[PDB]
Scaffold this active site. Structure first.
Site, short mmCIF file in Angstrom:
data_model
loop_
_atom_site.label_atom_id
_atom_site.label_comp_id
_atom_site.label_asym_id
_atom_site.label_seq_id
_atom_site.Cartn_x
_atom_site.Cartn_y
_atom_site.Cartn_z
N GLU A 249 0.82 -1.22 0.09
CA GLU A 249 0.01 -0.01 -0.07
C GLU A 249 0.68 1.28 -0.07
O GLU A 249 0.36 2.36 -0.27
CB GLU A 249 -0.77 -0.13 1.25
CG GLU A 249 -1.65 -1.40 1.30
CD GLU A 249 -2.89 -1.12 0.18
OE1 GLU A 249 -3.20 0.18 -0.25
OE2 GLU A 249 -3.50 -1.96 0.16
N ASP B 283 -6.93 6.70 -4.38
CA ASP B 283 -6.49 5.28 -4.62
C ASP B 283 -6.54 4.95 -6.10
O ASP B 283 -6.83 5.85 -6.79
CB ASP B 283 -6.93 4.25 -3.44
CG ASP B 283 -8.19 3.85 -3.80
OD1 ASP B 283 -9.13 4.50 -4.77
OD2 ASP B 283 -8.91 3.02 -3.35
N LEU C 102 -8.80 3.85 3.60
CA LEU C 102 -9.76 4.43 2.52
C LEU C 102 -10.45 5.51 3.35
O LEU C 102 -11.05 5.19 4.62
CB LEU C 102 -10.69 3.54 1.94
CG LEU C 102 -12.23 4.25 1.60
CD1 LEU C 102 -11.69 5.04 0.14
CD2 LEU C 102 -13.38 3.20 1.15
N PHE D 63 -7.96 -6.88 3.63
CA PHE D 63 -7.70 -5.50 3.81
C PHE D 63 -7.85 -4.50 2.60
O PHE D 63 -8.44 -3.41 2.75
CB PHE D 63 -6.36 -5.44 4.02
CG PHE D 63 -5.69 -4.19 4.45
CD1 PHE D 63 -5.17 -3.27 3.50
CD2 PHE D 63 -5.59 -3.85 5.65
CE1 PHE D 63 -4.93 -2.09 4.02
CE2 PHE D 63 -5.01 -2.53 6.04
CZ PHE D 63 -4.65 -1.65 5.27
N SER E 245 -12.49 -19.99 -5.31
CA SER E 245 -10.95 -19.93 -5.19
C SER E 245 -10.74 -20.57 -3.47
O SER E 245 -9.97 -21.36 -3.32
CB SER E 245 -10.46 -18.46 -5.04
OG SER E 245 -10.07 -18.39 -6.39
N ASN F 124 -7.87 -19.53 -10.81
CA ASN F 124 -9.05 -19.12 -10.51
C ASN F 124 -8.96 -17.67 -10.00
O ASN F 124 -9.79 -16.97 -10.31
CB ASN F 124 -9.83 -20.04 -9.69
CG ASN F 124 -11.47 -19.48 -9.36
OD1 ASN F 124 -11.70 -18.72 -8.55
ND2 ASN F 124 -11.88 -20.02 -10.43
#
Ligand SMILES: [Cl-]
Ligand SMILES: [Cl-]
Length: 162
Positions: free
Chosen positions: A11, A20, A32, A104, A117, A132
């Site tokens: 990040e 972002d 965020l 996250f 998945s 996948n």
């Protein structure tokens, strides 16, 4: 390596409000602020999060505090999630870190959406999970990061991060 070092790598760290990859107002280490197109709404969310009048700027310590909160919440979210808990419980330590990373970034709901998945992960079908998980908007939008996470999930090692 660990979940904090991992996410910090993915990040980055920014002390001023920024947008972002999706164009949303963010700050610190991927925190965020809001999905609203208003910087003011963003500045408001910020001040409320931090507890002071920031004026869209925070210190390192402040960023790190938000980060700690964010990691904790992701872990707690996973464990309270009926679809997620069992997957996480079945994995080893490195792969759990991969799951926390996804949560996250996309939120519980988003991850819970990789149903196929997740099932494969539970069955320990490593190569299938990777194939996948790549068929996703997630991978098409932020491929380098997605690749790092997928590799992590696939191999159970931190190779992608070293
Ligand atoms: Cl908050
Ligand atoms: Cl990327």
């Amino acid at each position: 390596m660990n979940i904090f070092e991992m996410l910090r790598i993915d990040e980055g760290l920014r002390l001023k409000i920024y947008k972002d990859t999706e164009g949303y107002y963010t700050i610190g280490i991927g925190h965020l602020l809001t999905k609203s197109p208003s910087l003011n709404a963003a500045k408001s969310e910020l001040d409320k999060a931090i507890g002071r009048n920031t004026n869209g700027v925070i210190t390192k310590d402040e960023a790190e505090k938000l980060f700690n909160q964010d990691v904790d919440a992701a872990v707690r979210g996973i464990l309270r999630n009926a679809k997620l808990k069992p997957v996480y419980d079945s994995l080893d330590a490195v792969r759990r870190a991969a799951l926390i990373n996804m949560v996250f970034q996309m939120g519980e709901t988003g991850v819970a959406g990789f149903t196929n998945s997740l099932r494969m992960a539970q069955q320990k079908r490593w190569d299938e999970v990777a194939v996948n998980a790549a068929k996703s908007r997630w991978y098409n939008q932020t491929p380098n990061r997605a690749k790092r996470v997928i590799t992590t999930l696939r191999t159970g090692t931190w190779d992608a991060y070293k």
